[PDB]
Each structure stands twice: as structure tokens, then as C-alpha cells.
Design a protein around this ligand. Structure first.
Ligand SMILES: CC(C)CCC[C@@H](C)[C@H]1CC[C@H]2[C@@H]3CC=C4C[C@@H](O)CC[C@]4(C)[C@H]3CC[C@]12C
Ligand SMILES: CC(C)CCC[C@@H](C)[C@H]1CC[C@H]2[C@@H]3CC=C4C[C@@H](O)CC[C@]4(C)[C@H]3CC[C@]12C
Ligand SMILES: CC(C)CCC[C@@H](C)[C@H]1CC[C@H]2[C@@H]3CC=C4C[C@@H](O)CC[C@]4(C)[C@H]3CC[C@]12C
Ligand SMILES: CC(C)CCC[C@@H](C)[C@H]1CC[C@H]2[C@@H]3CC=C4C[C@@H](O)CC[C@]4(C)[C@H]3CC[C@]12C
Ligand SMILES: CC(C)CCC[C@@H](C)[C@H]1CC[C@H]2[C@@H]3CC=C4C[C@@H](O)CC[C@]4(C)[C@H]3CC[C@]12C
Ligand SMILES: c1ccc(COCCCc2cnc[nH]2)cc1
Lengths: 215, 342, 286, 57, 231
């Protein structure tokens, strides 16, 4: 600072510090969402209005004065527990499960259990999506739910069969502090952004209550 | 038939190597260095705190002038620091914020970084326009970029999560050599002082020694029980140290082709993120998940001291080329500069 | 006699260091820069000066019974004491208003969270409006009403026995702030209960209902403590003005007088200590 | 025929690693101890320098 | 390419006002501090004003302070110099100079072509006005300062410039030892304390010109008289 050049070098550093705070404030206003699910569980088209901005695929959209950043990590074939901590500060997790695929149904259950009980996602809420519920209802006639779940003993009606699958996933949550937002959606459904927005708004309020000291 | 016979020959070869290493294991490094006096207690104070990163810091690398360093954080910012004054020299906005590694070129004209985007981006620090610009994006890895190190202004070695390492020609943007043989994600690499060899540690709990020019694996080092996260060459180039998730650090010798010493404590049950040596190599500094950095006696496997100045994981550390100070980066978004006092 | 001196000293000790830790933690941690964190600091700053400037200077007034610091210094003490107490009440409304926005306008609150420009602007408005309520009144009452009715050796406000001014000032000093805090903390409870009702319509559902009850008890204590400390003195000032101290026992006035200063020692326990961010900073420092 | 192709490569690699010259561990240990001893004085972290010579005062 | 074009100069009446403009192209203008440097006809260089990046710091020379105003327009990449009460002492060629300041930077690296205006403190000494030279022979140029240019941080804030006939000055040596980008390695700067030497090994035709030593230890920046090399 004593030298004439050091004074200008210090001034340059201060200008850099000011831009770092401005960028960080704008970055904290974005809702970052981690998108997970099976290999083909409908996560590619979970939201129609979203547009993409081997690697991580980031997708962003704006809904009701809120900016959502969706990260799809399905392209990373490497070990998940070596890079899953990069999303420890995610607002919520969107988990997609296909109800019309019994072969991958048990794959989703064990995938859900690891993520739900992960050491880096203890306080992270999950927005569970059960896609293709219309195909599940059509296919539940010929193919009973007992094929994928041998222990299932309830009625074969569509309403109870879908509810039993949802209860299977919510049973994987062993932490009372975690809230899971389940939703039954179709392939032609076009209100998935509202479901995410409603679930994120509830999460934000819980975060705000922690921020304001009420919690 | 043919496959069964061949895989039996591999087991015989593995036993041959194991017997060969046992033959030359006449003594232990612990027995050799028992007579020498301990380093005592190593007390280091935080001389500098580098503030400005707003997210987890994942990597740092000193420049060769022992004054400038580059750090990477997942706020999408590459920052170059003047460690003497804590002045920020540059702030490079990253196209992909999921950065996992960063490197400072020995010439000081370039920095490199890359992460989950599977790209190693080269940034030019000395431009006539007065700003840092991307000069090259090295594509070709099918997994995340875990580590990168410059050999010179035109060559860089990268390790990836697709189980392979690559040697790149920066000017042409093509990988001249591909280093294959790891069965797990390669998490780190270290260059030998002469830059003719480099070691890499993967998630198959093994360390392989690669020849840069020849392009093949010379030696394979096993002994860890979990994924290797960190690796660092000994200052003379004849040894290297690794850090794994099994809460242990091991010192392997290139010429003896085996482990020489293990650095673990009963209290330590957390994974290791980063390892480095002091200028003389007598101290081995390791960053841990338990928010601390433990300074080990390399020769005697004694914990010489602890650097406790972070509230989250110590994700990276590095020692200057002149050996004057050690920097520690952490998930708490701070960098700290440490050295002792008389 | 010495017991009273210890009790006054205890209040000084608790108020000074109790509000100092909040200021120390704010400086120590650079992540405590949200608008809520500034408001807790402002409440701590306003309450810190109460126990370090007002209460220590008022101790001789009680032990000796006369103001021996002079007429000139009495006006300074009166202005500072009324400025800090008014700002402490206005900070509580500011904090409760901040918590009301977070629950109701959650999307807009999070976008504007961390905007230090708004935080400082609202902090200054608290102190400016606090001074304009009693600053000009205390200073210019003697110079506009003629002489001063305050006997030599006594230090209290010129409007101490005025009736029309006290009821009007108290309406903007305690009656409006108390209803604002009550309305804000009630709207938080209604929004939390309403939002949980739609959520339910298991172990997770039990925890959320239990959490809502914990917030309800937290909101009730905050309204109770602020009301309990300020209502007696505010009502007594109006009641005593009507009968000119004949109907109000002398020792009742002092007991309610120290309740307001007791509020400056409970505020660090309520707002910052129960705050999660400040709780971590206290553990980090000690 | 993916496994049989990989098996030949893995066996061939183990031959190269098994043909290297190995020195005794005592010889390797002495060299590491010698290097640490020779450069001990020029290690600021091992032996802290006087405050006048410390750039990070 | 990096460009600095000056405009607005010309013949003005004494006591008048004139506005000089410096348009920047090909580099990040907002990242560079900017100087105005003038050179009286058949005289040496004289620093006029300085405005930092971000317009936070502004310096003026004493001979022009109060009459000249320096300003910049970052979105338009334009540097301004508002002059008032112009005197006959202000008749000079005014150069626009960019300078960026961080650890290891090279200030005063690029100069503009300059604009001519005609009107109707550490002392840097270059006693040797002219030096007869021959190609291929080693030449040394000496500079002196009234104060020590060595700072407590180890830097010696001495600069060397070369102004070839008809051309704008170019940076040769910055901080007394470092070689500027694009300068042949035959130039070498050596100094200690208050005495400095610029050695030119294997002199060539291009090296012919006037050499100026400037101090950047503190403001106001002062130039030496200049040493001319002739064949
Ligand atoms: C932190 C806690 C202990 C603070 C306690 C505050 C209360 C209980 C203490 C502190 C100051 C004390 C007052 C000091 C002076 C007087 C005036 C005297 O004529 C009646 C008693 C009375 C009114 C005391 C009542 C009790 C009192 C108000
Ligand atoms: C009787 C009065 C004048 C004594 C002084 C009280 C005031 C002026 C002092 C005491 C506590 C001090 C504050 C303590 C903490 C901070 C936070 C820091 O980030 C900005 C300065 C700031 C905000 C200080 C401003 C000045 C301050 C408010
Ligand atoms: C917005 C807030 C901070 C403004 C505070 C202004 C205060 C600090 C200033 C403004 C007017 C000043 C008062 C003006 C007149 C007098 C009467 C004199 O016999 C004692 C000093 C005294 C009592 C001054 C004390 C300090 C004072 C009250
Ligand atoms: C007894 C009288 C003089 C006390 C007067 C208190 C006033 C003048 C002081 C005490 C607390 C101070 C505030 C403390 C914190 C901040 C936040 C900072 O970012 C801007 C200044 C600001 C807003 C200060 C403004 C002045 C301030 C409000
Ligand atoms: C004469 C004046 C002082 C009496 C008025 C007292 C009350 C009504 C005043 C004093 C402090 C004021 C608050 C100060 C700051 C804010 C934050 C702003 O974003 C919303 C209004 C709000 C919440 C004000 C509401 C009205 C308020 C509570
Ligand atoms: C009604 C209610 C409140 C007021 C002024 O409030 C500040 C009181 C100052 C004080 C009392 N005890 C300690 N300090 C005026 C009328």
C-alpha cells in the first residue's frame, strides 16, 4: 500500500472483492435442484418449459419470479460417492420413478435408499415423481402389482396399487427432519413446474424460519 | 479353457512379484530411522486468511515464485492470490462451476481447471488485452476431471474418473498419450521433479507409476484398503505418499517397489483429502475430513503437529517451492497460510 | 442497601457483556450479513448502550436520591435514555416484521435476503424516528413553554407530568409497536398452521406438528416478554399523570421503571441466542 | 471375446512389472533419510526462519 | 490489436479551453489505469495526470492541477482530458498511456500516437544529452535520482522508455530490471539505489532514438531529460 503501484494494486483487489459479492448475491437467488432417478424414468422431460443451458447437464427455467437450476447427473458413469458431495448445498432433490417398468422398480428402491440416507443429504428434502401413472393404470389390469412386489397383499385397484408403491419409497426415509413431496404425474401432464414450485416454496419457508431464528 | 488358463498365469505372476518384494524387504523404514531424533512439536500459525470464495474450495496450487497461488471454488470462480499481501490478482469466472482441480503453470503464464464437465480448460494470464481468457478446452475424457498438472506451457497431464490418465498437447488440443490400466476412478496425480514420470492414485486402492514419454505403466503399488484420494511425490523423486479413505497415509518407494511406512492414528477414522511434503521431505502434511491438517514425521511416522483452523473439510493443501509456507483450502470457503516462528 | 447496589450492578454486568457477545459475533463472522442479522445487531447496539451509559449514570440518582451531575448533563442523559428505549422497541417491530415477510413473502424475502443496502436503510430509519419522537420534545420544551418546573437536583423529562403528550406519545411508543408485534407473530402462526394443514391433507407428520407447536410457544414468549416489560411503565405514566402521583405509590414507579431496562437484558437471550446462525457463532468464539 | 482379450493384456502387463530391478528396503530407506538430513537446514517449515526472513510476518 | 487514438488537439488561443479524447480498442479498457503524458517540442516527457481503473483515484501534476480535468467513459472506452485556461507553457504533444497495476504487471507498456496542442518531487537527471554510437557496439546510458527508488518491498520503481524519431515512446525496462514484452533481450537494466544504467549490447539501427528514465516510486511521476543515441 505504501508504494504508488501497491496502492493501485490494492485498489484493483478491492474492485475484485466487490464483484465477488455481487456475483454471490445473484448466485444465492437461484434454486438449485439435483435431478436423480433410473436410467429411463422420465427425468429428461420432467418439465416442458425448461431449456438446457457425458458431463453434467444443467437445465434452467424461471417460474413465478423464481429461477430453478436442474442438474442431471445421469451422464456420469463413474463412482457416484466421489462427486455426490458437490451437490451438498442443493435446495431439493427431484427423484423420478417410472411406474410402468417393474424390472427397474426395485432398482429405484435401492437407489432411493442410498440417496435418502446419504451422509451429505440428511437435511435435503426430496420431490418424488412417479411418472407414467396413466400407463401404470392401463398395465395394472393384465399385470398385477404382485409381480414386482411379492409381499404386496392389497387390492389390485389402480388407486391402492399406486399408493402402495409411494409408501414403499417413503419408508426408506429414516430421518424425521426430511420431508418427501410425492406426486403422481402422467406423460401428458403439464403442471410439473407448479408441483416443484409448491414444494420448493415449502422448503424455502422452512429455510427462512431457520434464517429468522424461529426454528 | 484359454481364458481360465490365462487368468491362472496372472495369479502366478502376482505371487512372483509379491515374493520378489518380500525378498528385498530386509529391513523396515521404522527400524532404519529409529536412531534419529524426532522433529519435536511443529507449531504453525495462520499468517494469512484468504477470503472471497463464497462456496466450497476444492483445489489450490502454488505458483513457482512461492508468492502467487490459484484456488478453485464451486462458486464458479478461479482466484489468483498474492499471498504476501492477500491481494486478489485475478478472478476468473468459470463456465462450469463444478470444478474439482486447478493447476498453476510453472512459467506462471497459464492456469488450468476442470471438474464434472469432463473438460480441462486452459486460461492465459498474460494477454495484451489485460484480461484472462480461455485458450484451450481439452475434451476427450468421459468422466470428471480429478487432477491436472502442467509439465510446461504446451503439455499437461490430466487424470479423470473414466479410469484413464492423458497427456495433452495444449497447442493442438489433442491428447498425445493415454494412460490406461486403472480399474477405478483416478482421483489424483503427482509429477516427478524431472517431469519424466508421474504417479496416479485411483479408487481401486492402487497407485501406478507411469512413464510420460513411453506411455506405459512401469510399476503398480497396492496396500490401501479404500479409494486413494491424494498422492504426492517425494522431493527427490524416488518415493511418493498417498492418502486414502481408510484414514491412512502410506509411503511407497519407486526403486524398492513396495510400501515403506504407514501414517495412521487410532483417533483418525476419517478420509484423507490431500497430501504434500515439506521442502526437505521430512514433514508429510495431510488434510483430513475431521476439519484438521495433521503434520507427520515422514521418517518416524510421528504426528508432529496439527493445523486446526477450518470449520469444514480440509479439501486441499500445498507447500511453496521454497518451503516457506503451507496453504490449506477448505469447504468453509477460506484459505489459510501457515508457517512457524523461532 | 448493599443488596440493591448489587442488583443494579448485576443488571449492568448482564446487559453490557450480554449485548457485547452479539456485537462480537457479528464482527467475527462475515456470513452474518443478512438483513435479519443486521436487525439483531441494531437491537444489540441499542441495548448495549443502555447498560453501559444510562444505567451506570443513573445509579447515583438512586443511592443518593439527587442528580449531582448538573442540569446540562441531565438533558444529555434524558435524550440518550429515551432514544435507546424507543429504538429498542422499534427494533423489535423491525425484527418481527422481518420474520413476517419470511413466512408470507418467502420468494421475495429470499431474493432480497443479504441486501445490506436495505438493512442499513431500515436501521437508520429506526434511530432517526426514535430521536424525532422525543429528541426535539425534551430539548425544546423548556425553551418554548417558558421556564422549567424541574427542581434542582432532580433529573426527569419536562413532560413527566403532562397528560395529553404522554398518551399521544405512548400510542406511538408502545401501543402501536405492541399491536404490530402481536399482529406479525400471530400471522406467522396462522400461516404455519394453514400450510401444515394442507400438507397433511407417520413419523414425519408427527415431527412437523411438534415443530409448529414449538414455534407457537416461541412466538408467544416474545410477545409476552416485550409486553410484560413495557406495559406497566407505559400504563403507570398515563395513570400517574392524571393523579399527579397521588394515586400511584412511589415505589411502584421505580419498579416499573426498571422493567424497561430489564428488557435490555432479556433481549440477547430471546432473539440472538435462539437464532441458529448466532448460536453457532457463540460456540465458535467460546 | 472381451474377457479373453483383456486377460492377454493384463498378463502381458504383469510381465513388464515383474522384470524391474529392486533395491533393498534398507538401501531405499537410507537414501530417503540422507536427503532429509542434507536439506534439513533449508527447510523453513521444519526449522522456522527468523521473523526478519519470513515473508508472512 | 491494442490501439490508442488521440484527437482534439490543435491551435488554440491563450486562455482558451480544449477537450482531448483518447479512444481505446483491442483491450479491456476498464481494467487499465490511464495517464496523460506530454512532451514539449525539442524537450523531454512530462507527466500530466492519472486516473485509475474504476475512476476512484485521480492525480494531477502541480503545473496543471486545478486547470486540467481527466475523466474516462468505460462503456465507450474513451479517455478524456478537459483543459482550461491554456497557457503557452501547455504547447506539447500529449500522449495517452495505458497502465495496469497488479503483482508482476508491466505499467506504461502501451502508448498512444499522441495529439499535438499549440497555444498562440524526485528529480531524475540524465546529464549526458547525446551519445555517439556505432552499430554492433555496446552502449550504456546512465540515470540518476535525487531520492532512492528502492522501496521496502524490494522493487525499484525505475522505468526506461525509447522514443524513436517520429514514433511514440515504447517501454523497454520496467522496475529497473524486468524486460518489457516484445523487447529484444539485448536490452538490460541494471541499477542500485540512486544510480541506474541501461546497457544495450549489439546496438542496431532500430535502437537509435532518445531514451528516458522515469520514476514511479511516488506521484508526481517525473522524467529525465533524455539521452539521444546518434550514429
Ligand atoms: C438481572 C436482575 C437481577 C435485575 C433485577 C432488577 C430489579 C429486581 C432490581 C434492580 C434495581 C432495584 C431497584 C433499585 C431502587 C429501588 C428504589 C427503592 O426506593 C425501592 C426498591 C427499588 C425499586 C429496587 C427494586 C428492585 C430492583 C428494581
Ligand atoms: C456512547 C457511544 C458513542 C459509544 C459507542 C457506541 C457505538 C458508536 C459503537 C459501539 C459498538 C460499535 C459497533 C460494533 C460492531 C460493528 C460491526 C462492524 O462490522 C461495523 C462497525 C460496528 C457497527 C460498530 C459501529 C460503532 C459502534 C456501534
Ligand atoms: C439520530 C440520533 C443519533 C441523533 C442524536 C442527536 C444527539 C446526539 C445530539 C443532537 C442534539 C444534541 C443536544 C443539543 C442540546 C443539548 C443541551 C445541552 O445543555 C446539553 C447537550 C445537549 C443535550 C445535546 C446532547 C446531544 C444531542 C442530543
Ligand atoms: C447515544 C447516541 C449518539 C447513539 C447514536 C447511535 C447511532 C448514531 C449509531 C449507533 C449504531 C450505528 C449503526 C451501526 C451499524 C451500521 C451498519 C453499517 O453498515 C452502516 C452504519 C450503521 C447504520 C451505523 C449508523 C450509526 C449508528 C446507528
Ligand atoms: C413518530 C413515529 C416514530 C412513531 C411511529 C412508530 C412506528 C409506527 C414506526 C417506527 C418504526 C417504523 C418501522 C421502521 C422500519 C420499517 C421497515 C420498512 O421496510 C417497513 C416499515 C417499518 C416496519 C416501519 C413501520 C412503522 C414503524 C414501526
Ligand atoms: C410511555 C411509554 C414510554 C415512554 C418513553 O419510553 C422510554 C422510557 C425511558 C425509561 C423508562 N425506564 C427506563 N427508561 C413514554 C410514555
Amino acid at each position: 500500500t505504501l508504494s504508488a503501484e501497491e496502492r493501485a494494486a490494492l485498489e484493483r483487489s478491492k474492485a475484485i472483492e466487490k464483484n465477488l459479492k455481487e456475483d454471490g448475491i445473484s448466485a444465492a437467488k437461484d434454486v438449485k435442484l439435483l435431478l436423480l432417478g433410473a436410467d429411463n424414468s422420465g427425468k429428461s422431460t420432467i418439465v416442458k418449459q425448461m431449456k438446457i443451458i457425458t458431463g453434467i447437464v444443467e437445465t434452467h427455467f424461471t417460474f413465478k419470479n423464481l429461477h430453478f437450476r436442474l442438474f442431471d447427473v445421469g451422464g456420469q458413469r463413474s463412482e457416484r460417492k466421489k462427486w455426490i458431495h458437490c451437490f451438498e448445498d442443493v435446495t431439493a432433490i427431484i427423484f423420478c420413478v417410472d411406474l410402468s417398468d417393474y424390472n427397474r422398480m426395485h432398482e429405484s428402491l435401492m437407489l432411493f435408499d442410498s440417496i435418502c440416507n446419504n451422509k451429505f443429504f440428511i437435511d435435503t428434502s426430496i420431490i418424488l415423481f412417479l411418472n407414467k401413472k396413466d400407463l401404470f393404470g392401463e398395465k395394472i389390469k393384465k399385470s398385477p402389482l404382485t409381480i414386482c412386489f411379492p409381499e404386496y397383499t392389497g387390492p389390485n385397484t389402480y388407486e391402492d396399487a399406486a399408493a402402495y408403491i409411494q409408501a414403499q419409497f417413503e419408508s426408506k426415509n429414516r430421518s424425521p427432519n426430511k420431508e418427501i413431496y410425492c406426486h403422481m404425474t402422467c406423460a401428458t401432464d403439464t403442471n410439473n413446474a407448479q408441483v416443484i414450485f409448491d414444494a420448493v416454496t415449502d422448503i424455502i419457508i422452512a429455510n427462512n424460519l431457520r434464517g429468522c431464528g424461529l426454528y | 479353457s484359454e481364458l481360465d488358463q490365462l487368468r491362472q498365469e496372472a495369479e502366478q505372476l502376482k505371487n512372483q512379484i509379491r515374493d520378489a518384494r518380500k525378498a528385498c524387504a530386509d529391513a523396515t523404514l521404522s527400524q532404519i530411522t529409529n536412531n534419529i531424533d524426532p522433529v519435536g512439536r511443529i507449531q504453525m500459525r495462520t499468517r494469512r486468511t484468504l477470503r472471497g470464495h463464497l462456496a466450497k474450495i476444492y483445489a489450490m496450487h502454488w505458483g513457482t515464485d512461492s508468492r502467487l497461488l490459484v484456488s478453485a471454488s464451486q462458486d464458479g470462480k478461479l482466484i489468483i492470490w498474492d499471498s504476501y499481501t492477500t491481494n486478489k490478482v485475478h478472478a476468473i469466472p468459470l463456465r462450469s462451476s463444478w470444478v474439482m482441480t486447478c493447476a498453476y503453470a510453472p512459467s506462471g503464464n497459464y492456469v488450468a481447471c476442470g471438474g464434472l464437465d469432463n473438460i480441462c480448460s486452459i486460461y492465459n494470464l498474460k494477454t495484451r488485452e489485460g484480461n484472462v481468457r480461455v485458450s484451450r478446452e481439452l475434451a476427450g475424457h468421459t468422466g470428471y476431471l480429478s487432477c491436472c498438472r502442467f509439465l510446461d506451457d504446451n503439455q499437461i497431464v490430466t487424470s479423470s474418473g473414466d479410469t484413464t490418465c492423458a497427456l495433452w498437447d495444449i497447442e493442438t488440443g489433442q491428447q498425445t498419450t493415454t494412460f490406461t490400466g486403472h480399474t477405478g476412478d483416478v482421483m489424483s496425480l503427482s509429477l516427478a521433479p524431472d517431469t519424466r514420470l508421474f504417479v496416479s492414485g485411483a479408487c481401486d486402492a492402487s497407485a501406478k507409476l507411469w512413464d510420460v514419454r513411453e506411455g506405459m505403466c512401469r510399476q503398480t503399488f497396492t496396500g490401501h484398503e479404500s479409494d486413494i484420494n491424494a498422492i504426492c511425490f517425494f522431493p527427490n523423486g524416488n518415493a511418493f505418499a498417498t492418502g486414502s479413505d481408510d484414514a491412512t497415509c502410506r509411503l511407497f518407494d519407486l526403486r524398492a517397489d513396495q510400501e515403506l511406512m504407514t501414517y495412521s492414528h487410532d483417533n483418525i477414522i476419517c478420509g484423507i483429502t490431500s497430501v504434500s511434503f515439506s521442502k526437505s521431505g521430512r514433514l508429510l502434511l495431510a488434510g483430513y475430513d475431521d476439519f484438521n491438517c495433521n503434520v507427520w514425521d515422514a521418517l518416524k511416522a510421528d504426528r508432529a503437529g496439527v493445523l486446526a483452523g477450518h470449520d469444514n473439510r480440509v479439501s486441499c493443501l500445498g507447500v511453496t517451492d521454497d518451503g516457506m509456507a503451507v496453504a490449506t483450502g477448505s469447504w468453509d470457503s477460506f484459505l489459510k497460510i501457515w508457517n512457524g516462528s523461532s | 442497601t448493599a443488596v440493591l447496589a448489587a442488583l443494579m450492578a448485576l443488571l449492568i454486568v448482564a446487559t453490557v457483556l450480554g449485548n457485547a457477545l452479539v456485537m462480537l459475533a457479528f464482527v467475527a463472522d462475515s456470513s452474518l450479513r443478512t438483513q435479519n442479522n443486521f436487525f439483531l445487531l441494531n437491537l444489540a447496539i441499542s441495548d448495549f448502550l443502555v447498560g453501559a451509559f444510562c444505567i451506570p449514570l443513573y445509579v447515583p440518582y438512586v443511592l443518593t436520591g439527587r442528580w449531582t451531575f448538573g442540569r446540562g448533563l441531565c438533558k444529555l442523559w434524558l435524550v440518550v435514555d429515551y432514544l435507546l428505549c424507543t429504538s429498542s422497541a422499534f427494533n423489535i417491530v423491525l425484527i418481527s416484521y422481518d420474520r413476517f415477510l419470511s413466512v408470507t413473502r418467502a420468494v421475495s424475502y429470499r431474493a432480497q435476503q443479504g441486501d445490506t443496502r436495505r438493512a442499513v436503510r431500515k436501521m437508520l430509519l429506526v434511530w432517526v424516528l426514535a430521536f424525532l419522537l422525543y429528541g426535539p420534545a425534551i430539548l425544546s420544551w423548556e425553551y418554548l413553554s417558558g421556564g422549567s418546573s424541574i427542581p434542582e437536583g432532580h433529573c426527569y423529562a419536562e413532560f413527566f407530568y403532562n397528560w395529553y403528550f404522554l398518551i399521544t406519545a405512548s400510542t406511538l411508543e408502545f401501543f402501536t409497536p405492541f399491536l404490530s408485534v402481536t399482529f406479525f407473530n400471530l400471522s406467522i402462526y396462522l400461516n404455519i398452521q394453514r400450510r401444515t394443514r394442507l400438507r397433511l391433507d407417520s413419523f414425519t407428520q408427527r415431527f412437523r406438528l411438534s415443530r409448529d407447536r414449538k414455534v407457537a410457544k416461541s412466538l408467544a414468549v416474545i410477545v409476552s416478554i416485550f409486553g410484560l416489560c413495557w406495559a406497566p411503565y407505559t400504563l403507570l405514566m398515563i395513570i400517574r399523570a392524571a393523579c399527579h402521583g397521588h394515586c400511584v405509590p412511589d415505589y411502584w414507579y421505580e419498579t416499573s421503571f426498571w422493567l424497561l431496562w430489564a428488557n435490555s437484558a432479556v433481549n440477547p437471550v430471546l432473539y440472538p441466542l435462539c437464532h441458529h446462525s448466532f448460536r453457532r457463532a457463540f460456540t465458535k468464539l467460546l | 471375446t472381451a474377457s479373453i482379450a483383456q486377460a492377454r493384456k493384463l498378463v502381458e502387463q504383469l510381465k513388464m512389472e515383474a522384470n524391474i530391478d529392486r533395491i533393498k528396503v534398507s538401501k531405499a530407506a537410507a537414501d530417503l533419510m540422507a536427503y532429509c538430513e542434507a536439506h534439513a537446514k533449508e527447510d523453513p517449515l521444519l526449522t522456522p526462519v527468523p521473523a526478519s526472513e519470513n515473508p508472512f510476518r | 490489436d491494442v490501439q490508442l487514438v488521440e484527437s482534439g488537439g490543435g491551435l488554440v488561443q491563450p486562455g482558451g479551453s480544449r477537450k482531448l479524447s483518447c479512444s481505446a480498442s483491442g483491450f479491456a479498457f476498464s481494467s487499465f489505469g490511464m495517464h496523460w503524458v506530454r512532451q514539449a517540442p525539442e524537450k523531454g516527457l512530462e507527466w500530466v495526470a492519472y486516473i485509475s481503473s474504476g475512476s476512484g483515484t485521480i492525480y494531477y501534476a502541480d503545473t496543471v492541477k486545478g486547470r486540467f480535468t481527466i475523466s474516462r467513459d468505460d462503456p465507450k472506452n474513451t479517455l478524456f482530458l478537459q483543459m482550461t485556461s491554456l497557457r503557452s507553457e501547455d504547447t506539447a504533444m500529449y500522449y495517452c498511456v495505458r497502465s495496469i497495476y497488479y503483482y508482476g504487471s508491466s505499467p506504461f507498456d502501451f502508448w498512444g500516437q499522441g495529439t499535438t496542442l499549440t497555444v498562440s518531487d524526485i528529480v531524475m537527471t540524465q546529464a549526458t544529452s547525446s551519445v555517439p554510437v556505432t552499430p554492433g557496439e555496446s552502449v550504456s546510458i546512465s540515470c540518476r535520482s535525487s531520492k532512492s527508488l528502492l522501496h521496502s518491498n524490494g522493487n525499484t520503481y525505475l522505468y526506461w522508455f525509447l522514443q524513436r524519431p517520429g514514433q511514440s515512446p515504447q517501454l523497454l525496462i520496467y522496475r529497473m530490471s524486468n524486460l518489457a514484452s516484445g523487447v529484444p533481450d539485448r536490452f538490460s537494466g541494471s541499477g542500485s539505489g540512486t544510480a541506474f544504467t541501461l546497457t544495450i549490447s549489439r546496438l542496431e539501427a532500430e535502437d537509435v532514438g532518445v531514451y528516458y528514465c522515469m520514476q514511479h516510486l511516488e506521484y508526481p511521476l517525473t522524467f529525465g531529460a533524455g539521452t539521444k543515441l546518434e550514429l
